[PDB]
Amino acid sequence: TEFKAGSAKKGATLFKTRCLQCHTVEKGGPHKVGPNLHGIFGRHSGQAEGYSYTDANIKKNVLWDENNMSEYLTNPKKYIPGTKMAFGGCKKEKDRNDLITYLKKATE
Amino acid sequence: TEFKAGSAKKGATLFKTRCLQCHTVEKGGPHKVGPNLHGIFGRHSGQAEGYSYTDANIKKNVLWDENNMSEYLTNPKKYIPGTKMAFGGCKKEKDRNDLITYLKKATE
Numbered sequence A, B: 001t002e003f004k005a006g007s008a009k010k011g012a013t014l015f016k017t018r019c020l021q022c023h024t025v026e027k028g029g030p031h032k033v034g035p036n037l038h039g040i041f042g043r044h045s046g047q048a049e050g051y052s053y054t055d056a057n058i059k060k061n062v063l064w065d066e067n068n069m070s071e072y073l074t075n076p077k078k079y080i081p082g083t084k085m086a087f088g089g090c091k092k093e094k095d096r097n098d099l100i101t102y103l104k105k106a107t108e
């Protein structure tokens, strides 16, 4: 792709220090600030039920792939102007590779 | 995305008139000229086992999504220079939407 696997272990701790505050990844995990992410790869944005997404997310209608996911994490608001996800971004491709590697595995 | 659903019925007959000559879509379907396509969405290119892909396909390492799939079908060789898939292309977005709609459903 334009994405290369990293460390799922490293990615797990990135998740805990940078995403856990607002999300869960487990099947049967609840929505918190942000939606539960189980089964996000291959799904379009704004389709988790029981979650109130912004108009922005839903209309962007991104199809979530490891590659899309990478550009999004770099700068969320640049990618989805108007999204209420208050996360600065993950600048280093190495960090992003690790995180996505972790996500691809735990959200399945 | 940049893809919108069509007619899976229309897409099924497009498949039969334009792709069947070289591919199968069913789980447990055999490779023919081209590889069996069961479970192609979310998979990267050149990963079907027992199939001899060109160097081109494998190194392109496309992650197959309905959107990627669309650009590919427009013009395969323009998209994967050196691919041995001898298919001209599907010029109309309407045709492509229908086909991909069919594929998303039958390759799952």
Ligand code: HEC
Residues within 6 Å of the ligand: A015, A018, A019, A020, A021, A022, A023, A033, A034, A035, A040, A044, A045, A046, A047, A048, A052, A053, A054, A056, A057, A073, A082, A083, A084, A085, A086, A087, A090
């Ligand atoms: C709270 C401060 C958040 C943190 C930290 C992270 N995310 Fe988030 N995310 C949050 C919200 C409120 C939302 C919904 C946005 C809206 O505008 O409706 C999101 C959304 C996502 C998405 C899109 C999901 C979809 O179903 O379309 C993804 C893929 C996502 N968030 C992932 C994610 C990751 C991996 C994070 C750590 C780097 C992360 N987010 C941080 C809130 C918050």
Ligand code: HEC
Residues within 6 Å of the ligand: B015, B018, B019, B020, B021, B022, B023, B033, B034, B035, B040, B044, B045, B046, B047, B048, B052, B053, B054, B056, B057, B073, B082, B083, B084, B085, B086, B087, B090
């Ligand atoms: C024989 C004349 C073909 C027709 C008609 C179609 N395809 Fe094909 N396809 C063919 C070959 C020999 C190969 C392998 C290419 C290589 O260079 O190794 C392919 C490949 C694909 C792929 C990539 C699959 C992967 O696993 O990476 C896809 C997604 C694909 N073909 C789909 C497809 C569709 C939907 C067609 C009808 C419009 C179609 N192909 C026509 C041979 C032939």
